[PDB]
Amino acid sequence: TEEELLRKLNEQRDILALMEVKMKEMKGSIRHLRLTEAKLREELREKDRLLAMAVIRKKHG
């Protein structure tokens, strides 16, 4: 039941708890980013399609 070991246990708890906060903010950042990517890849694919058609409509017309 040594005083300084216990204080060490708690230091670590404080350290863990901080890390759990950062990880929390990081996994939010990822889910947001994967959704931002997904939306951007969707949009790009729609613009490439529009471009393809613009080229075609000019070649044949």
Add this chain to the structure above:
Amino acid sequence: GTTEEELLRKLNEQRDILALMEVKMKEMKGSIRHLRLTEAKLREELREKDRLLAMAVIRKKH
């Protein structure tokens, strides 16, 4: 003499946990840098395709 074996088992346990969580966080910040880059590339690539289309409009307007 060296101290309570309980405390000590506890210190080591949490230490193991600190180290594991450090790993995950190193991966997670990887992911974020690759995802942020990837966002920037795609935004750029969009920015170029919008512009080509805006022109294709203007040139087929005139």
